[PDB]
Amino acid sequence: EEIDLNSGSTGDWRKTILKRAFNIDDVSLFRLLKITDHDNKDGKIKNN
Amino acid sequence: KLRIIHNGYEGQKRNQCNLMNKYGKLGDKFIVYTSLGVNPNNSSNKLMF
Amino acid sequence: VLTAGLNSQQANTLHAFLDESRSAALSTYYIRQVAKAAAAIKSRDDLY
Known part of the structure; x- marks a missing residue:
């Protein structure tokens, strides 16, 4: 399941799962992803 | 007796x-009637004839 | 999305208010309809 963590996007309930799990808004969540992978061109997550 | x-x-x-x-x-x-019920509709009594 | 951005206290008070207003609506629906006509269920207490 591909998950949209793009700063500028509303995504699946799954994005929301990430949001409650980490207590973060969409913006900082995107930053967090960028700290995870700097080569990730789009806010997509393998979900693994 | x-x-x-x-x-x-x-x-x-009775x-x-x-x-x-x-x-x-x-x-x-x-004629007599075995089962008497209060109505779902039209009743406010909780009473029955 | 709104719920996700909450600390545990607002979360607890959320699940609380939800369950309360829910029990209210669910019970008054189960009294008004879906209740077997035999039992005289005309009040909340009677539902209890």
């Missing part, structure tokens, strides 16, 4: 039964 009494079990039976005695003599024949 044997006793036969027509009185209803306290509750509806009411029906009391109607039977007041308004008809013994040996009389008539």
Whole structure:
């Protein structure tokens, strides 16, 4: 399941799962992803 | 000495039964109703005839 | 999305208010409809 963590996007309930799990808004969540992978061109997550 | 009494079990039976005695003599024949319910609609009483 | 951005206290008070208003609506629906006509269920207490 591909998950949209793009700063500028509303995504699946799954994005929301990430949001409650980490207590973060969409913006900082995107930053967090960028700290995870700097080569990730789009806010997509393998979900693994 | 044997006793036969027509009185209803306290509750509806006794009411029906009391109607039977007041308004008809013994040996009389008539219709009675086993199950009485309060209506889902049109009722505010929690009471039944 | 709104719920996700909450600390545990607001979360607890959320599940609380939800369950309360819910029990209210669910019970008054189960009294008004879906209740077997035999039992005289005309009040909340009677539902209890």
